[PDB]
Write a protein that binds this ligand. Structure first.
Ligand code: JV2
Length: 164
C-alpha cells in the first residue's frame, strides 16, 4: 500500500502541530519513495530541521531545501535530480502534495502543499500525495506567509517520519 508520513512543524521554536500525508506509491512509486525516505532520514539526510522557505497565502507552502535553506537546493535519494515520473495526478485542490522544480526533470527534495486548486501547474509539477490530517496546521503555516513568499516567523520541520 501507500505510505503515511508526518511532518511536525514549529514557528519561531513553538509547535504548530502535525501534518499527515499519504504518498501515492500506487501512481508515482519513485517520487513517493524519495519523499518517504527523506521523511525517515534513512539515507543519512532529509527534511528534519529544514524550513518552509516560501509561503504564499491563497497558493501554497513550499519546503524541502535542506542543503541551502533558500529555495536553490535540496537533493533526492537518487542523486541531485530525477525525472518527472508522470503527470497522472492533478492539482485538484487544497491539500495536494507536489514536487517543486527548476523545469523539466529537475525533481530533488523541494515540495509544496497547496492551499488552493493550482490546476495551472498540471503537467509541469509531479503530484505525489495529499494531506490526510493536519490541514489546520498547513493553514497556520500559510498565515505566516506573504505574497512575496517571505515568512514572518521561521517555520521549521522539527521532526518527520513514517506512520505506516
Ligand atoms: C515561486 S511561486 C511559483 C510560481 C509558478 C510556479 C511554481 C511556483 C513555486 C510554488 C510551487 C512550486 N514552485 C516552484 O517549484 C518554483 N520553482 C522553484 O522553487 N525552484 C527551485 C528548485 C526546485 C527544485 C530543485 C532545485 C531548485 C535545485 C535542486 C534540485 N531540485 C534540482 O537539481 C534542480 O535545482
Amino acid at each position: 500500500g501507500n505510505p503515511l508520513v508526518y511532518l511536525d512543524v514549529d514557528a519561531n521554536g513553538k509547535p504548530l502541530g502535525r501534518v499527515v500525508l499519504e504518498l501515492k506509491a500506487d501512481v508515482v512509486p519513485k517520487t513517493a519513495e524519495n519523499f518517504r525516505a527523506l521523511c525517515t532520514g534513512e539515507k543519512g539526510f532529509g527534511y528534519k530541521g529544514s524550513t518552509f522557505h516560501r509561503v504564499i497565502p491563497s497558493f501554497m507552502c513550499q519546503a524541502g531545501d535542506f542543503t541551502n535553506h533558500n529555495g536553490t537546493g535540496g537533493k533526492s535519494i537518487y542523486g541531485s535530480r530525477f525525472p518527472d515520473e508522470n503527470f497522472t495526478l492533478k492539482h485538484v485542490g487544497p491539500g495536494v502534495l507536489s514536487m517543486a522544480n527548476a523545469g523539466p526533470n529537475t525533481n530533488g527534495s523541494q515540495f509544496f502543499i497547496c492551499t488552493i486548486k493550482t490546476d495551472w501547474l498540471d503537467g509541469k509539477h509531479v503530484v505525489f500525495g495529499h494531506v490526510i490530517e493536519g490541514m489546520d496546521v498547513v493553514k497556520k503555516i500559510e498565515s505566516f506567509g506573504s505574497k512575496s513568499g517571505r515568512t514572518s516567523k521561521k517555520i521549521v520541520i522539527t521532526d518527520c517520519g513514517q506512520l505506516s
